[PDB]
Design a protein around this ligand. Structure first.
Ligand SMILES: [Cl-]
Ligand SMILES: [Cu+2]
Length: 99
């Protein structure tokens, strides 16, 4: 599935922000507006056994360009809470349920 990074209206948001995906299904986070953006999963908000370092972009990596995206494939079932480092304080966070 595809999630847009930033609304055209200026919102620093994941569109959709709360969504579901089946185990093994990919999620492609594409820059839309308001970038730089990046996608970082909260180590304390991801299913048991998942390595946040494998499913996250480095806090120092940013999708700085308009056509850039970040693809991640999640398998362990449960909810995962992720955010954008630069806009975390502005409310740019999201949740995905892997069923
Ligand atoms: Cl992992
Ligand atoms: Cu951002």
């Amino acid at each position: 599935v595809e999630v847009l990074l930033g609304g055209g209206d200026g919102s620093l948001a994941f569109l959709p922000g709360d969504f579901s995906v089946a185990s093994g299904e990919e999620i492609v986070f594409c820059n839309n507006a308001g970038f730089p953006h990046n996608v970082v999963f909260d180590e304390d908000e991801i299913p048991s056994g998942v390595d946040a370092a494998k499913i996250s972009m480095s806090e120092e990596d940013l999708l700085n360009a308009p056509g850039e995206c970040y693809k991640v494939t999640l398998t362990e079932k449960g909810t995962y809470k992720f955010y954008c480092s630069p806009h975390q304080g502005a409310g740019m966070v999201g949740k995905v349920t892997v069923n």
